Design a protein around this ligand. Structure first.
Ligand SMILES: Cc1cc2nc3c(=O)[nH]c(=O)nc-3n(C[C@H](O)[C@H](O)[C@H](O)COP(=O)(O)O)c2cc1C
Ligand SMILES: Cc1cc2nc3c(=O)[nH]c(=O)nc-3n(C[C@H](O)[C@H](O)[C@H](O)COP(=O)(O)O)c2cc1C
Ligand SMILES: [Cl-]
Ligand SMILES: [Cl-]
Lengths: 122, 122
């Protein structure tokens, strides 16, 4: 399950980064800390406006990496912390996962990350 | 020439993300907005403490992606913006490139990103 300090990071503002595998190299896109919706102990849902290249990548290789953090949350050995999340991704345009982020009217889809690991890297 | 909005983001707090190509998929690591040092029109230096896997990746494939942003800086459609940087990476342990981040007493090296493109993605 996702750890307590991760939820503390979500309560603070910041830029989330999401890396996928493309045909010719990695691709890297963003969301905001505040936009992540956690379901159960292992699903993180992201509202999708663009992410067209990201979606194409995920369709061929479901594996994603995600990082996020905050200066305002104590880490393992000082002020500030962050996490590296590894998981499998899928895009949804309806159902409970889309409904989880449907408050964002600009969302054309939901990016659903099923987390396999969460490492506190700072 | 990095744009003024990019410099504004650097004046605000946040988590920077750096993606490299690994042997089995992408790799994704972090620094802080305030740690970045801009050398000139297109070089950004990051203090390196860990980044051992990142360094190994860069030796195989110099191409890197970097994202950063801030809720506090104006984007195209209201508050909040960020950037995708595409370029090539190198590691240095001396010279002006290292001196640029030498204030970080823990730095084992400097990661120098030569920027090919900077895109405001919000
Ligand atoms: C700080 C920040 C937050 C962003 N938030 C989102 C978001 O929540 N959803 C989204 O689809 N794109 C968001 N974007 C834009 C994406 O990072 C990306 O540029 C866009 O979705 C296109 O993705 P693609 O290159 O995979 O086509 C954000 C960008 C930044 C800098
Ligand atoms: C918010 C945040 C800031 C970080 N800042 C640095 C940094 O400035 N330099 C560094 O080497 N590692 C930093 N780290 C740790 C790296 O992201 C990474 O986990 C570590 O360097 C190992 O890199 P590697 O997986 O390439 O071996 C930071 C981590 C977080 C979450
Ligand atoms: Cl946020
Ligand atoms: Cl910062």
């Amino acid at each position: 399950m996702l750890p307590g300090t991760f939820f503390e990071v979500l309560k603070n503002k910041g830029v989330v980064a999401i890396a996928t595998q493309g045909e010719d190299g990695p691709h890297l896109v963003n969301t905001w800390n505040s936009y992540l919706k956690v379901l159960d102990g292992n699903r993180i849902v992201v509202p999708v406006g663009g992410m067209h290249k990201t979606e194409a990548n995920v369709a061929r290789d479901e594996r994603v990496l995600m990082t996020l953090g905050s200066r305002k949350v104590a880490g393992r050995n000082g002020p500030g912390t962050g996490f590296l999340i590894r998981g499998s991704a899928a895009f949804r345009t309806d159902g409970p996962e889309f409904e989880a982020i449907a408050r964002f009217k600009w969302a054309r889809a939901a990016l659903v990350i099923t987390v396999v690991s969460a490492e506190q890297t700072l």
